[PDB]
Coordinates of C-alpha atoms and ligand atoms in Angstrom, one line a residue:
Chain A
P1 CA 8.7 -21.6 -3.5
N2 CA 6.0 -18.9 -4.2
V3 CA 3.9 -19.1 -1.2
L4 CA 2.1 -16.1 0.1
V5 CA 1.9 -14.9 3.9
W6 CA -1.3 -13.3 5.2
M7 CA -1.2 -11.1 8.5
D8 CA -3.8 -9.4 10.7
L9 CA -2.6 -6.6 12.8
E10 CA -4.3 -4.7 15.6
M11 CA -2.7 -1.5 16.8
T12 CA -3.5 1.1 19.5
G13 CA -3.8 3.7 16.7
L14 CA -2.6 4.8 13.2
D15 CA 0.6 6.9 14.0
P16 CA 3.6 4.4 14.3
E17 CA 5.6 7.1 16.1
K18 CA 3.2 7.1 19.0
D19 CA 1.2 3.8 18.6
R20 CA 2.2 0.2 18.8
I21 CA 1.1 -3.5 17.8
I22 CA -1.0 -5.4 20.3
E23 CA -2.1 -8.4 18.3
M24 CA -0.8 -10.2 15.3
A25 CA -1.6 -13.4 13.4
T26 CA -0.3 -15.2 10.3
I27 CA -1.7 -17.7 7.6
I28 CA 0.4 -19.1 4.8
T29 CA -1.4 -20.2 1.5
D30 CA 0.1 -21.0 -1.8
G31 CA -0.3 -19.3 -5.3
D32 CA -3.9 -20.7 -5.6
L33 CA -5.2 -19.8 -2.1
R34 CA -5.2 -23.2 -0.6
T35 CA -4.0 -22.7 2.9
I36 CA -0.6 -24.4 3.8
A37 CA -0.6 -23.7 7.4
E38 CA -2.1 -21.4 10.2
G39 CA 0.2 -19.4 12.4
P40 CA 0.3 -18.2 15.9
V41 CA -2.1 -15.6 17.3
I42 CA 0.1 -13.5 19.8
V43 CA -1.1 -10.7 22.0
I44 CA 1.8 -8.3 22.7
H45 CA 1.9 -6.5 26.0
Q46 CA 2.1 -2.7 26.1
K47 CA 2.5 -0.4 29.1
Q48 CA -0.9 0.3 30.8
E49 CA -0.1 4.0 30.2
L50 CA -0.2 3.6 26.5
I51 CA -3.7 2.0 26.5
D52 CA -5.3 4.9 28.5
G53 CA -4.2 7.4 25.8
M54 CA -6.1 5.7 22.9
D55 CA -9.0 7.7 21.4
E56 CA -12.7 7.0 21.5
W57 CA -12.6 4.7 18.5
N58 CA -9.7 2.5 19.4
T59 CA -10.8 2.2 23.0
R60 CA -14.5 1.3 22.1
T61 CA -13.5 -1.5 19.7
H62 CA -10.6 -3.0 21.4
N63 CA -12.6 -3.1 24.7
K64 CA -15.5 -4.6 22.7
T65 CA -13.3 -7.4 21.5
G66 CA -11.6 -8.2 24.8
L67 CA -8.0 -7.4 23.5
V68 CA -7.5 -4.7 26.1
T69 CA -7.5 -7.3 28.8
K70 CA -5.6 -9.8 26.9
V71 CA -2.8 -7.1 26.7
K72 CA -3.0 -6.4 30.3
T73 CA -2.4 -9.9 31.4
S74 CA 0.1 -10.7 28.4
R75 CA 3.9 -11.3 29.1
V76 CA 4.8 -11.3 25.6
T77 CA 7.2 -8.5 24.3
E78 CA 7.5 -7.3 20.7
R79 CA 10.8 -8.9 19.9
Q80 CA 9.3 -12.2 21.4
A81 CA 6.2 -12.1 19.1
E82 CA 8.5 -11.3 16.2
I83 CA 10.6 -14.6 16.8
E84 CA 7.6 -16.9 17.1
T85 CA 6.0 -15.5 14.1
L86 CA 9.2 -15.5 12.1
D87 CA 9.9 -19.1 13.3
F88 CA 6.6 -20.1 11.7
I89 CA 7.1 -18.1 8.4
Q90 CA 10.8 -19.6 7.9
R91 CA 9.3 -23.1 8.2
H92 CA 7.1 -22.7 5.2
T93 CA 8.8 -19.9 3.0
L94 CA 12.1 -19.2 1.6
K95 CA 13.7 -15.6 2.2
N96 CA 12.4 -12.8 0.0
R97 CA 10.0 -15.0 -1.9
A98 CA 6.7 -14.3 -0.2
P99 CA 4.7 -11.1 -0.3
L100 CA 2.3 -9.6 2.2
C101 CA -1.5 -10.1 1.6
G102 CA -4.8 -8.7 2.9
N103 CA -6.8 -5.5 3.1
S104 CA -4.7 -3.5 5.5
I105 CA -1.5 -3.7 3.3
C106 CA 0.0 -0.1 3.6
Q107 CA -1.3 0.1 7.3
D108 CA 0.2 -3.1 8.4
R109 CA 3.7 -2.6 6.7
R110 CA 4.2 0.7 8.3
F111 CA 4.2 -0.9 11.7
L112 CA 6.0 -4.1 10.3
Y113 CA 8.9 -2.1 9.0
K114 CA 9.4 0.0 12.1
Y115 CA 8.8 -2.5 15.0
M116 CA 9.7 -5.8 13.5
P117 CA 12.7 -5.2 11.1
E118 CA 13.9 -8.9 10.9
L119 CA 10.4 -10.1 9.8
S120 CA 10.2 -7.4 7.4
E121 CA 13.4 -8.2 5.6
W122 CA 12.5 -11.8 5.4
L123 CA 9.3 -10.9 3.5
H124 CA 9.5 -9.9 -0.1
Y125 CA 8.9 -6.2 -0.8
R126 CA 5.8 -6.7 -2.9
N127 CA 2.2 -7.0 -1.8
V128 CA -1.2 -8.3 -2.9
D129 CA -3.8 -5.7 -2.0
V130 CA -7.2 -7.4 -2.0
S131 CA -8.7 -4.0 -1.7
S132 CA -7.2 -2.9 -5.0
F133 CA -9.3 -5.6 -6.6
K134 CA -12.6 -4.5 -5.1
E135 CA -12.1 -0.9 -6.2
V136 CA -11.3 -2.0 -9.7
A137 CA -14.2 -4.3 -9.8
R138 CA -16.5 -1.4 -9.1
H139 CA -15.7 0.0 -12.4
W140 CA -15.0 -3.0 -14.7
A141 CA -17.2 -5.8 -13.5
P142 CA -19.8 -4.6 -10.9
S143 CA -22.1 -7.5 -11.5
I144 CA -19.6 -9.6 -9.8
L145 CA -19.8 -7.9 -6.4
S146 CA -23.4 -8.8 -5.5
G147 CA -22.4 -12.5 -5.3
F148 CA -20.0 -11.9 -2.3
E149 CA -20.9 -11.1 1.2
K150 CA -18.1 -10.6 3.8
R151 CA -19.2 -12.7 6.8
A152 CA -18.9 -12.0 10.6
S153 CA -15.4 -12.3 12.0
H154 CA -14.5 -12.1 15.6
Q155 CA -11.0 -13.7 15.9
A156 CA -7.7 -12.6 14.2
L157 CA -7.4 -15.9 12.2
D158 CA -11.2 -15.5 11.0
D159 CA -10.3 -12.0 9.9
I160 CA -7.6 -13.4 7.8
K161 CA -9.8 -16.1 6.3
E162 CA -12.5 -13.5 5.2
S163 CA -9.7 -11.7 3.3
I164 CA -8.4 -14.9 1.5
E165 CA -12.0 -15.7 0.8
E166 CA -12.5 -12.4 -0.8
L167 CA -9.6 -13.0 -3.1
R168 CA -10.8 -16.5 -3.9
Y169 CA -13.9 -14.8 -5.3
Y170 CA -12.1 -12.5 -7.4
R171 CA -10.0 -15.4 -8.6
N172 CA -12.8 -17.5 -9.6
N173 CA -15.1 -14.7 -11.0
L174 CA -12.9 -11.7 -12.1
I175 CA -9.8 -13.1 -13.5
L176 CA -8.8 -15.3 -16.5
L177 CA -6.3 -18.3 -16.8
Chain B
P1 CA -18.0 11.0 -10.6
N2 CA -15.8 7.9 -11.0
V3 CA -12.5 9.2 -11.9
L4 CA -9.0 8.0 -10.8
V5 CA -5.8 10.3 -10.0
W6 CA -2.4 9.1 -11.0
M7 CA 0.8 10.5 -9.3
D8 CA 4.4 10.1 -9.6
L9 CA 6.6 11.3 -6.7
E10 CA 10.4 11.5 -6.3
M11 CA 11.9 12.0 -3.0
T12 CA 15.4 12.3 -1.3
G13 CA 15.0 9.0 0.2
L14 CA 12.5 6.6 1.9
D15 CA 12.2 7.9 5.6
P16 CA 9.5 10.6 5.7
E17 CA 10.9 11.7 9.2
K18 CA 14.1 12.7 7.3
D19 CA 13.3 12.9 3.6
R20 CA 11.2 15.2 1.5
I21 CA 9.4 15.4 -1.9
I22 CA 11.3 16.9 -4.8
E23 CA 9.2 16.1 -7.8
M24 CA 5.4 15.3 -8.3
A25 CA 3.3 14.9 -11.2
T26 CA -0.6 14.1 -11.7
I27 CA -2.7 12.5 -14.4
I28 CA -6.4 11.9 -14.2
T29 CA -8.2 9.1 -16.1
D30 CA -11.8 7.8 -15.9
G31 CA -12.9 4.2 -14.9
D32 CA -11.8 2.7 -18.2
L33 CA -8.4 4.3 -18.3
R34 CA -8.9 7.0 -20.9
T35 CA -7.1 10.0 -19.9
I36 CA -9.2 12.9 -18.9
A37 CA -6.4 15.6 -18.3
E38 CA -2.6 15.8 -17.6
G39 CA -1.5 17.7 -14.7
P40 CA 1.5 19.9 -13.7
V41 CA 5.0 18.7 -13.2
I42 CA 6.4 20.6 -10.2
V43 CA 9.8 20.4 -8.8
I44 CA 9.9 21.3 -5.2
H45 CA 12.8 23.2 -3.8
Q46 CA 14.7 21.8 -0.8
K47 CA 17.6 23.1 1.2
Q48 CA 21.0 22.6 -0.4
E49 CA 22.0 20.8 2.9
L50 CA 19.4 18.0 2.6
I51 CA 20.4 17.1 -1.0
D52 CA 24.2 16.6 0.3
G53 CA 22.9 14.0 2.8
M54 CA 21.3 11.5 0.3
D55 CA 22.9 8.1 0.0
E56 CA 24.7 6.8 -3.0
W57 CA 21.6 5.5 -4.6
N58 CA 19.4 8.5 -4.5
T59 CA 22.4 10.8 -5.4
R60 CA 23.3 8.6 -8.3
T61 CA 19.8 8.5 -10.0
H62 CA 18.7 12.1 -9.1
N63 CA 22.0 13.5 -10.5
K64 CA 21.5 11.1 -13.6
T65 CA 18.1 12.6 -14.4
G66 CA 18.9 16.2 -13.7
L67 CA 16.5 16.5 -10.9
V68 CA 19.1 17.8 -8.5
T69 CA 19.9 20.8 -10.6
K70 CA 16.1 21.4 -10.9
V71 CA 15.5 21.4 -7.3
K72 CA 18.7 23.9 -6.9
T73 CA 17.1 26.6 -9.0
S74 CA 13.6 26.0 -8.0
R75 CA 11.6 28.7 -6.2
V76 CA 8.6 26.6 -5.4
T77 CA 7.6 25.5 -1.9
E78 CA 5.7 22.3 -0.7
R79 CA 2.6 24.3 0.3
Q80 CA 2.6 26.0 -3.2
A81 CA 3.1 22.7 -5.1
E82 CA 0.3 21.4 -3.2
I83 CA -2.1 24.1 -4.0
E84 CA -1.3 23.9 -7.8
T85 CA -1.6 20.1 -7.8
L86 CA -4.8 20.3 -5.9
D87 CA -6.3 23.0 -8.0
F88 CA -5.8 20.6 -11.0
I89 CA -7.4 17.8 -9.1
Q90 CA -10.3 19.8 -7.9
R91 CA -11.2 20.7 -11.3
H92 CA -11.8 17.1 -12.7
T93 CA -12.7 15.3 -9.4
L94 CA -15.3 15.4 -6.5
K95 CA -14.1 15.2 -2.9
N96 CA -13.4 11.8 -1.5
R97 CA -14.4 10.1 -4.8
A98 CA -11.0 9.6 -6.4
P99 CA -8.4 6.8 -5.4
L100 CA -4.6 6.9 -5.8
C101 CA -3.1 4.6 -8.5
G102 CA 0.4 3.6 -9.5
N103 CA 3.1 1.3 -8.5
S104 CA 4.5 3.3 -5.5
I105 CA 1.2 3.4 -3.7
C106 CA 2.3 2.7 -0.1
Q107 CA 5.5 4.7 -0.6
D108 CA 3.8 7.7 -2.1
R109 CA 1.0 8.0 0.3
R110 CA 3.4 8.0 3.3
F111 CA 4.7 11.3 2.0
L112 CA 1.4 12.6 0.8
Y113 CA -0.2 11.9 4.2
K114 CA 2.5 13.8 6.1
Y115 CA 3.6 16.6 3.8
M116 CA 0.4 17.5 2.1
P117 CA -2.5 17.0 4.3
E118 CA -5.0 19.0 2.3
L119 CA -4.4 17.1 -0.8
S120 CA -4.5 13.7 1.0
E121 CA -8.0 14.5 2.7
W122 CA -9.4 15.6 -0.9
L123 CA -8.3 12.1 -2.3
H124 CA -10.4 9.0 -1.3
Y125 CA -8.7 6.7 1.2
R126 CA -8.6 3.7 -1.2
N127 CA -5.8 2.8 -3.8
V128 CA -5.4 0.8 -7.0
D129 CA -2.1 -1.0 -6.7
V130 CA -1.0 -1.9 -10.3
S131 CA 2.0 -3.9 -8.7
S132 CA -0.7 -6.1 -7.0
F133 CA -2.1 -7.3 -10.3
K134 CA 1.4 -8.2 -11.5
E135 CA 2.2 -10.4 -8.5
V136 CA -1.3 -12.0 -8.8
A137 CA -0.7 -12.7 -12.5
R138 CA 2.5 -14.5 -11.6
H139 CA 0.5 -17.2 -10.0
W140 CA -2.8 -17.3 -11.8
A141 CA -2.1 -16.4 -15.4
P142 CA 1.7 -16.3 -16.2
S143 CA 1.0 -16.7 -20.0
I144 CA -0.2 -13.1 -20.0
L145 CA 2.9 -11.4 -18.9
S146 CA 5.1 -12.2 -21.8
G147 CA 2.9 -9.9 -24.0
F148 CA 3.8 -6.8 -22.1
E149 CA 7.1 -4.8 -22.1
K150 CA 7.7 -1.9 -19.8
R151 CA 9.0 1.0 -22.1
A152 CA 11.8 3.4 -21.3
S153 CA 10.5 6.3 -19.3
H154 CA 12.4 9.6 -18.6
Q155 CA 10.0 12.2 -17.7
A156 CA 7.5 12.2 -14.7
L157 CA 4.6 12.1 -17.0
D158 CA 5.9 9.2 -19.0
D159 CA 6.4 7.2 -15.8
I160 CA 2.7 7.7 -15.1
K161 CA 1.8 6.7 -18.6
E162 CA 3.7 3.6 -18.4
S163 CA 1.8 2.6 -15.1
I164 CA -1.6 3.3 -16.9
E165 CA -0.6 1.3 -19.8
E166 CA 0.4 -1.5 -17.5
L167 CA -3.1 -1.5 -16.0
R168 CA -4.7 -1.3 -19.5
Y169 CA -2.9 -4.6 -20.3
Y170 CA -4.3 -6.2 -17.2
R171 CA -7.7 -4.9 -18.0
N172 CA -7.8 -6.2 -21.6
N173 CA -6.1 -9.5 -20.9
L174 CA -6.6 -10.5 -17.2
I175 CA -10.0 -9.3 -16.2
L176 CA -13.7 -10.2 -17.2
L177 CA -15.8 -7.3 -18.0
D178 CA -19.4 -6.1 -18.5
Ligands
MN1 MN1 -8.6 -8.6 14.0
MN2 MN1 9.9 9.5 -11.8

């Protein structure tokens, strides 16, 4: 009906013409942010040559989380990760009725549109940028922001939860029924 | 200090590797949406070959607004449009302190990052997606939306105003202040 899908994507870099997706995860909530179901956490395999070309930053952080070794031993291709993720989404959503949500909205949707076209056409074109509410709250209600602390997050699903919790706080403190 | 830049971009299509910018305009407001200044409306010239390759949709709407004939007679290059727009922004903003605002946030920032790198590095990385508030209001306060009607808009600056007015309404009806 009008559920929301939340996704976390890790990539080898920022340029979609050169870089690729290496980890994705999905969580589906409803309109009032109560989670309907948690989706799969897929590590996509990329060629060992592509990983050696990443810059300092992406090599430091992806080796610090253990994603690089997961990619090395993964057998999952991009088309395969798309089907398993889309099979999860299709069970809880209708086509072209669910927007993307998170803090990397434009960054995620670039790689989604290029590397997973069937998933991107099942999603609705709209987005819910949680980051757009934090920048608005800086000017209109700065007193609210002291009462929220983003917590440590190590897994992909915990990254998604911390974004949903951030929007809960804007819902219960910044907005009006 | 705390100002916001608003931009309206028209392109020959959606793929930045093939398509280009043909019209841009800028308006700068402050934190509470009172407009500080209105910027230039530049029509960027592209080769006549590129315009003939646009699909039905982009050819129908850009010929319906008269942009195609403006591009044909324009002498302004992309680097030139960037300097005049950046000269306007640099007068009212500080570097890396002003985010983008509008309803085509991701779509505009793709072409901005590729075709105008000096402008994109002067802007702050953050955005204010007005469209993200309309989708949120659909679930949390649908009673608000009946009281707003997007009005007809024909120029580029009037397109920007209608986005600013949309955010005014969310400010004065959806949010909680002080
Ligand atoms: Mn993550
Ligand atoms: Mn326009």
